Amino acid sequence: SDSKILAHLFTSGYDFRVRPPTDNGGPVVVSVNMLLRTISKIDVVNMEYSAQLTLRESWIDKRLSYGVKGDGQPDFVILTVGHQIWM
Amino acid sequence: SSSLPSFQLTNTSTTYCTSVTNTGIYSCLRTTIQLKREFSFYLLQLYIPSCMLVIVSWVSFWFDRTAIPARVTLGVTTLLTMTAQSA
Amino acid sequence: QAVVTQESALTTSPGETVTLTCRSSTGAVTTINFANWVQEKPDHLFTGLIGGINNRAPGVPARFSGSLIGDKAALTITGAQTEDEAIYFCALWYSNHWVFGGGTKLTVLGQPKSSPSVTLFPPSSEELETNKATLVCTITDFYPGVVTVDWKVDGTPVTQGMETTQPSKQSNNKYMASSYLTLTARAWERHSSYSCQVTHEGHTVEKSLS
Amino acid sequence: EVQLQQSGPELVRPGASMKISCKASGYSFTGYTMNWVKQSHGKNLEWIGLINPYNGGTSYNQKFKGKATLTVDKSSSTAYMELLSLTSEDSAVYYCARDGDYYRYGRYFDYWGQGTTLTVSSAKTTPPSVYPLAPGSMVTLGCLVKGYFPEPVTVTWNSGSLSSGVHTFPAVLQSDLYTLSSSVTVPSSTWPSETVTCNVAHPASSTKVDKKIVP
């Protein structure tokens, strides 16, 4: 199922080097969420600080749509190793 | 300059440093920044306190010559402190 | 390519609430279009109002406000003022450059409406002598000061050869405008039907010629 | 208060190239990027390009790639704009508009300049030719001051006799030569039993011509 859905997406001509297409040729809109985990080592001498966070990016890549409306298929598929995606 | 608190980047230059070595003549560029050390720190942490220390050694000239313990205590303490600060 | 569209003109009274809109031809106006709104007072006085994400220029009154009503950018003046009467341009950001609209001439009413006085002038014989023929169409005493001139030779509308001046203000607070359709003497005799129809604030006035 | 004062109006022949300025004051000049806008009589407002004073960096509208060249002089807080291979189409009013954000691009307009009017025409001082405008066979008459240069031209009616109903319209720039027209409204039955001469004056060439309207 999931492995088949992935295979269907990359069996065609997909180039992870090419930017995702847009309807009006506009730019790819990347929504960003950010989760701070820890903020440590606030160095005042070197004026810097350490921080560990979780970066969360979300964009649309019509080329990767498999279910479209879906409602018969899984909402989403976890991308496994060995499958390149424009990022 | 805001991330460089201890110095003041006064001047920059862009030059060539092409040189002739044993393996051949290699083209070379050289950028140069000029750093001027901030004085405010050394005024407060070195000069001011030392004057203040030397001036203290003088207030023993106003103690009666009979009370030498007081004089020595001043002169000696300021001298020791002088050493420490320098260290 | 991509075109921005605005209301030709709008009318409102002091105190009311008017809304100008800005339409994109490629689709719905999204946040990555950074809809900007610019005001042009008479004598070429431009100033920014809204723009960017949701920021505004320094000093822009509180009555001004931006939004994305429907699928186009909006500019809402809540409690219109007399001085608010100006031309408003909106600008959209398409990828790497700005594209402006046609502008909207907002009128804050100060007198009763007045339909335009249209006149059509055939080419002078003195001018035809030089192998040139100029149709002149004059429009006076109209308000609010926004019209739309349209020419038509022999039933068919004309695309080129026409020139219409910008609504100029009269001594009596009403507006005027002129429009010239240019032809050649040999081409002015080639036809016999000429139309100069002027639209103003809805409805239309036409002046023909033969 | 901030201010953007641009250079004065300029008249240049086609093929040449001139440079208009925009002196900024009242703010840290190097902190806000500058836009250049072109307002022409033939089209709408066009965005030419923008420049970051602090950076020297520029980004042009594909349309003006090669037509305009944005530069900046930090010392004098002035933004300049070159215009090459000037032609008839370049005759317009060029504004300079500041961006809103402080040391970053915010994509919204702050203050504009008063504008600079650039007139590009290969014309010599040319006296106008006045052609009468009579109504096709309350009546309205008109004059047609066609093909003059440079502006302005003044139009009266009966040497000032009639002033009510007089409208001298804006001029249009066609064929490197300006052209306007003035109308005057009178009660139909009086014309043509009353002399209706229009007075056209072109001071730039010392021209004075009378042409009374007649059917």
Side-chain angles (χ1 to χ4, degrees), chain A residues 1-68 70-87, chain B, chain C residues 1-185 187-202 204-210, chain D residues 1-137 139-215:
Chain A
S1 58
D2 278 41
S3 51
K4 302 175 63 179
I5 288 181
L6 290 177
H8 183 271
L9 294 183
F10 304 93
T11 193
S12 299
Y14 181 89
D15 204 336
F16 69 97
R17 304 171 298 189
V18 174
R19 195 207 76 172
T22 315
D23 300 340
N24 50 7
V28 169
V29 175
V30 178
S31 299
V32 175
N33 170 247
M34 192 166 293
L35 174 65
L36 269 44
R37 290 175 168 267
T38 54
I39 292 167
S40 46
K41 297 182 183 181
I42 301 186
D43 190 336
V44 182
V45 171
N46 300 125
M47 299 198 176
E48 61 191 26
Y49 72 115
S50 301
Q52 174 186 148
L53 75 171
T54 294
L55 178 52
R56 280 167 169 164
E57 313 190 291
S58 182
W59 62 95
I60 299 180
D61 195 333
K62 293 191 304 301
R63 295 173 303 179
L64 289 168
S65 78
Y66 61 93
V68 192
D71 312 333
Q73 280 182 300
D75 193 340
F76 67 83
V77 180
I78 292 184
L79 186 66
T80 62
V81 181
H83 302 275
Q84 277 290 250
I85 278 191
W86 176 97
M87 291 187 299
Chain B
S1 51
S2 60
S3 188
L4 183 55
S6 309
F7 296 83
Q8 177 188 350
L9 209 174
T10 64
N11 196 33
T12 60
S13 75
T14 174
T15 332
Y16 299 84
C17 60
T18 301
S19 62
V20 48
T21 67
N22 305 93
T23 48
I25 310 177
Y26 297 81
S27 180
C28 180
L29 308 182
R30 166 179 293 158
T31 174
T32 305
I33 61 179
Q34 175 174 321
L35 305 168
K36 177 179 186 176
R37 194 177 304 272
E38 285 295 351
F39 178 78
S40 301
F41 170 89
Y42 302 94
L43 171 61
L44 295 193
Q45 303 307 331
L46 174 100
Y47 294 104
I48 294 290
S50 289
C51 288
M52 177 261 200
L53 233 49
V54 169
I55 288 174
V56 167
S57 77
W58 296 347
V59 312
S60 45
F61 291 155
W62 307 86
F63 289 110
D64 54 335
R65 309 169 299 277
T66 69
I68 199 66
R71 289 192 171 199
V72 173
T73 287
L74 279 168
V76 168
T77 296
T78 57
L79 189 64
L80 186 162
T81 300
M82 194 70 203
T83 294
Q85 178 198 334
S86 182
Chain C
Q1 197 59 72
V3 194
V4 175
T5 306
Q6 305 185 231
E7 289 92 346
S8 193
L10 287 182
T11 307
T12 191
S13 301
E16 298 187 20
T17 295
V18 60
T19 297
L20 315 180
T21 69
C22 174
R23 172 177 302 278
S24 169
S25 64
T26 63
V29 178
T30 55
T31 64
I32 62 172
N33 284 128
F34 306 89
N36 260 261
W37 287 94
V38 172
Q39 181 196 71
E40 183 191 10
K41 291 293 195 62
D43 289 328
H44 298 347
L45 279 297
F46 282 88
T47 291
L49 290 313
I50 320 302
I53 294 302
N54 62 8
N55 38 19
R56 35 148 46 75
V60 175
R63 51 181 182 269
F64 293 84
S65 59
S67 55
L68 292 183
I69 292 184
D71 52 18
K72 50 175 180 288
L75 188 263
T76 294
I77 306 177
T78 303
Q81 298 292 339
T82 294
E83 57 275 2
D84 289 337
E85 178 172 348
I87 296 186
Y88 294 85
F89 298 93
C90 88
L92 301 187
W93 172 269
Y94 292 95
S95 303
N96 70 84
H97 60 89
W98 288 108
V99 172
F100 285 94
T104 304
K105 189 170 302 178
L106 177 57
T107 311
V108 171
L109 236 40
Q111 74 173 254
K113 306 201 164 191
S114 181
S115 286
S117 301
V118 186
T119 315
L120 185 48
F121 287 89
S124 47
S125 69
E126 310 188 3
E127 178 198 2
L128 293 179
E129 181 67 7
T130 62
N131 192 39
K132 271 69 179 64
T134 300
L135 280 292
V136 182
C137 183
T138 59
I139 322 170
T140 61
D141 296 271
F142 60 89
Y143 180 104
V146 191
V147 296
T148 300
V149 183
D150 290 322
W151 292 82
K152 303 188 308 178
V153 171
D154 286 312
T156 304
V158 194
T159 181
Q160 63 171 205
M162 52 170 299
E163 312 173 37
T164 300
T165 69
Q166 209 61 212
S168 181
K169 195 175 173 183
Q170 297 182 178
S171 60
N172 55 95
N173 288 280
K174 297 162 79 176
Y175 291 75
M176 66 180 189
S178 67
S179 177
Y180 311 78
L181 165 65
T182 320
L183 296 174
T184 45
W188 146 259
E189 304 171 346
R190 195 196 307 174
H191 311 252
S192 184
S193 177
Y194 299 99
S195 172
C196 169
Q197 52 188 24
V198 177
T199 297
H200 166 259
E201 185 61 6
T204 302
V205 175
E206 180 182 356
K207 285 309 189 73
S208 309
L209 193 159
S210 298
Chain D
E1 63 168 346
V2 319
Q3 286 191 22
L4 306 172
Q5 297 184 200
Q6 309 186 206
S7 61
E10 294 285 345
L11 172 59
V12 293
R13 287 183 168 273
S17 65
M18 63 81 49
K19 175 169 65 174
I20 61 188
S21 59
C22 179
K23 187 171 184 180
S25 56
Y27 75 96
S28 188
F29 171 72
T30 200
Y32 302 77
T33 82
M34 280 291 312
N35 298 277
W36 287 91
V37 173
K38 167 184 178 177
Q39 184 184 30
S40 46
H41 206 51
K43 305 186 180 186
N44 310 331
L45 297 178
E46 297 183 289
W47 181 79
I48 307 180
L50 86 170
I51 179 181
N52 184 338
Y54 176 84
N55 212 7
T58 57
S59 176
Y60 300 95
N61 183 342
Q62 184 61 213
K63 196 185 193 75
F64 298 82
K65 261 284 191 178
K67 169 67 65 180
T69 294
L70 308 190
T71 54
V72 63
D73 184 18
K74 300 180 180 181
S75 67
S76 62
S77 295
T78 308
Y80 299 82
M81 183 186 76
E82 290 256 4
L83 293 176
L84 301 69
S85 303
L86 293 170
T87 64
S88 307
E89 264 61 24
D90 292 323
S91 292
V93 177
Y94 295 81
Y95 300 87
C96 73
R98 189 181 77 167
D99 185 76
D101 269 342
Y102 187 66
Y103 286 92
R104 59 172 194 248
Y105 196 18
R107 291 195 197 86
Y108 69 97
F109 302 99
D110 264 345
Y111 307 79
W112 293 50
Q114 75 284 359
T116 301
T117 303
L118 177 58
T119 303
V120 181
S121 170
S122 54
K124 48 170 292 184
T125 306
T126 303
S129 305
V130 181
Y131 305 98
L133 309 182
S137 62
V139 65
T140 306
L141 310 176
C143 287
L144 183 61
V145 193
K146 170 195 179 80
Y148 66 96
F149 181 91
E151 298 196 35
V153 290
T154 55
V155 178
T156 73
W157 286 97
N158 291 315
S159 305
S161 173
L162 188 56
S163 58
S164 188
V166 173
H167 299 90
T168 298
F169 304 92
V172 300
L173 186 66
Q174 198 67 14
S175 314
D176 299 60
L177 296 170
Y178 292 103
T179 298
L180 59 71
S181 64
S182 181
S183 66
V184 59
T185 293
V186 293
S188 56
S189 303
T190 43
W191 193 76
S193 68
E194 298 181 355
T195 57
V196 183
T197 301
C198 78
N199 308 15
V200 183
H202 188 201
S205 58
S206 297
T207 296
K208 301 171 186 173
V209 44
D210 303 335
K211 290 288 299 178
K212 79 170 182 293
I213 311 303
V214 49

